[PDB]
Write a protein that binds this DNA or RNA. Sequence first.
RNA 1: AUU
RNA 2: AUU
Lengths: 293, 293, 126, 126
Amino acid sequence: SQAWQPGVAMPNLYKMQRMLLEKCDLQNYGDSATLPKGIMMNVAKYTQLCQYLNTLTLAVPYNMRVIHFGAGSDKGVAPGTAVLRQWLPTGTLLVDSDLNDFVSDADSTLIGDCATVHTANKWDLIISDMYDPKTKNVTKENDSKEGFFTYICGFIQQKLALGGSVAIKITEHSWNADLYKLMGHFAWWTAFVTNVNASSSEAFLIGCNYLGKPREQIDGYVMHANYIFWRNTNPIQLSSYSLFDMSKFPLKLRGTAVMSLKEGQINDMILSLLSKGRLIIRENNRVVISSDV
Amino acid sequence: SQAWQPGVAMPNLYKMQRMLLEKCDLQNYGDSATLPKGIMMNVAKYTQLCQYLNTLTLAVPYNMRVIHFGAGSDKGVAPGTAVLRQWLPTGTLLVDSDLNDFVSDADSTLIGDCATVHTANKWDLIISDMYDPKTKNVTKENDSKEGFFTYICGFIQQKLALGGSVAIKITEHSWNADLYKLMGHFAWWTAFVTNVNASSSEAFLIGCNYLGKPREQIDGYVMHANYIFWRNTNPIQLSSYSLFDMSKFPLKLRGTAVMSLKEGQINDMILSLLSKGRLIIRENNRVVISSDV
Amino acid sequence: VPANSTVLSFCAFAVDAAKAYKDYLASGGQPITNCVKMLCTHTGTGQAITVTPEANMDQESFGGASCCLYCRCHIDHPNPKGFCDLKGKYVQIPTTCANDPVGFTLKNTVCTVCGMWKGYGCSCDQ
Amino acid sequence: VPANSTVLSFCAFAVDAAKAYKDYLASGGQPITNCVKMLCTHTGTGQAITVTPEANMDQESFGGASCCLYCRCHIDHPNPKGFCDLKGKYVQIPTTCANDPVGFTLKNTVCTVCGMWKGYGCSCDQ
RNA sequence: AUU
RNA sequence: AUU
Ligand SMILES: *OP(=O)(O)OP(=O)(O)OC[C@H]1O[C@@H](n2c[n+](C)c3c(=O)[nH]c(N)nc32)[C@H](O)[C@@H]1O
Ligand SMILES: *OP(=O)(O)OP(=O)(O)OC[C@H]1O[C@@H](n2c[n+](C)c3c(=O)[nH]c(N)nc32)[C@H](O)[C@@H]1O
Ligand SMILES: Nc1ncnc2c1ncn2[C@@H]1O[C@H](CSCC[C@H](N)C(=O)O)[C@@H](O)[C@H]1O
Ligand SMILES: Nc1ncnc2c1ncn2[C@@H]1O[C@H](CSCC[C@H](N)C(=O)O)[C@@H](O)[C@H]1O
Ligand SMILES: [Mg+2]
Ligand SMILES: [Mg+2]
Ligand SMILES: [Zn+2]
Ligand SMILES: [Zn+2]
Ligand SMILES: [Zn+2]
Ligand SMILES: [Zn+2]
């Protein structure tokens, strides 16, 4: 049955370990999957990611705000953005961004280093597929990476609405301890591996329903070691079965309530609604975002 | 692309070996595949078998004659016969048979031991899924089996039209040396493993375009040893991808010519036409077949 | 006991097997299982009983014989025409009713004009 | 050189990029690649340009921006409305023409009444 | 990581 | 072998 899911989530048993960081040794490493004819790798990958997000309690307000970093590619197009625009409810504001120029179906496309992206607005969903190419260079030790991760950790803490969610791509060597720790500031979190790229150490750290405060204490270094151990001991076969039925793919628009934050008004009813995908807390004016340097 | 094919055929490299018979030790032995919701194992298996037959040079005459042994099942229905009826051209005579009573979509259903089946007519396609349950009983050595195989070897030699084809199911322990030897009396032959049951030693010995004389000399014992060696050294992953597109499933009715046999009329042009699925040699009157004992 | 043995025996024993099965269902009996569902494109005409699978996106195609109560009970058919409409063909069952194809073919009727299930595809009246 | 760089540069350099691409094609050039095909059910309305994938069984759905010559060349659009009809939407391309979606959107026109590709689904005249 |  |  596992081959028919969009992917595999890190079991809680493995989150609760205290492993030492090991080198990642996947049994099927580098293997390529055969996809439906003419489908790009990222169309399949993003479709499976969205299929998995469909099973979580994502808040889906009217006039949703979704931002997608790392949306460019060496092909000059943005397959991930096309999948996101297919998935999100009509009228959702979709903004994407990348270091290099590209063509996109998003409402606004921001070119430049993600650190040049400025906005006063808070967001409901943050998707990041960013990856530093120099990560491929051989290094002495697999240490926590800064760069865009730094920016991302700031964004989540400053520009993510309470109740919002994130999916941030990491790999064996492209990871950040503070991002893992921030995962404990959500109502729920996991590391999700799509079945079409199960031969890679790539995963998406998914935080569901942001709470703005530490609900769970997480040591990022230990948690990345736990992720690597889980990947090493639990091989996953490449699979694209979930791509054959798209009838239930669109994100169900639930009209999640949106309200503005007040001074110390987060009572336990508010935490309940936030943790169940029933409330987004942020202002709701027109969005103004730019990467002008 | 192997996972997207209906199955895997025994490479010619392995047919030409001279191995001794060993125990079959499949790495994934017994593993179950997840099929499309509500689809029976035999619907999937027969569909893949027919998908593979679609790639061969089967003669498809008007008023085709197909007979299917072992069409019953412990469920009292005949999924394989339903797949064959879907696959074969409309108007094709489909007769099936089994030891035990069952309900079928065939034109005639013959109940009883296959040795009780009598007919003067020759057939264009012989499908056999027969398997003796006592084959499961532990035995000292894996010897060539008689029983229905004996009957089958007679049928192919007496009641199969020139140009006709067969697909006979065998396993590690359910096999017959003379059947392998008869495989050399066809224009082409192979042992085909469906992807949905690749965790089993089951295969279909497929003979394509019967010539009535030995074109290739085959030692049945050695060839079954070769098959087991191939299965042992080339593991196959369970796969049902080919089941997701049925748009080109029906057998293409090409109206293969049918003519009656005469005394010593097999010139090399006739062999040419027979080996390409362009000619069936048999009479073409009304079929009368029975298992009345 | 083998699957369906009880209900198939009980229905074959009655003089009116259709009534016996409908009463069995109305008392909460589990529907007859192992009707043979086919793989198809689901881009067919949607007609009720056809020579090949003709399911549309709202139907499933089954082997006709496996969905016939009289075929499954090994009893004689009461069809006035003297033969079975299902054996040797393919029956399209609405997906919502695919849990009981034998019951569906028992309880429903085919429009002799358009070939659709009346109440499940036939729009001749409206 | 990266894929499509030559043809996209050549078209972006010309004053009439559509004519430049059509001439490139008429001389045997390889069509623009990496138009983003989406996964879909192929049970959609079949209309030409839609907010979600609407391919029918005879079409393929692509991300609109990746099938626009002007989007892909990073040049200004000559559309009289002042904006692009494709960017942010999904374009349905007949499967026989899916080898060159950019060429197809350049060479064809959408019926403003029914929304189908003129000559590939529009039956308003007949 | 952009199979 | 009738997962
Ligand atoms: O995309 P990746 O899965 O390669 O992760 P990465 O880019 O962070 O890793 C960089 C380099 O590590 C080496 N290597 C990584 N992994 C995960 C494996 C593996 O599983 N098996 C082997 N034999 N080598 C691996 C790669 O050189 C990779 O470029
Ligand atoms: O359907 P099968 O694949 O089991 O073939 P079979 O019925 O002819 O074999 C009968 C018995 O052999 C034993 N056994 C067979 N095979 C192929 C394997 C195998 O691959 N791995 C193991 N560990 N045992 C096998 C079975 O007892 C089987 O019933
Ligand atoms: N600091 C940074 N700021 C912005 N983009 C960055 C970045 N570091 C890496 N990236 C971008 O991360 C991207 C990874 S490739 C991502 C592929 C894309 N998701 C798709 O849909 O195909 C590259 O395009 C790279 O330019
Ligand atoms: N000597 C013999 N004569 C006739 N049938 C035989 C036989 N030996 C075994 N069989 C039959 O071989 C069958 C194997 S089960 C086959 C399943 C069937 N193909 C399906 O579509 O489900 C059993 O039903 C058994 O009764
Ligand atoms: Mg990969
Ligand atoms: Mg099996
Ligand atoms: Zn009947
Ligand atoms: Zn009608
Ligand atoms: Zn454009
Ligand atoms: Zn029109």
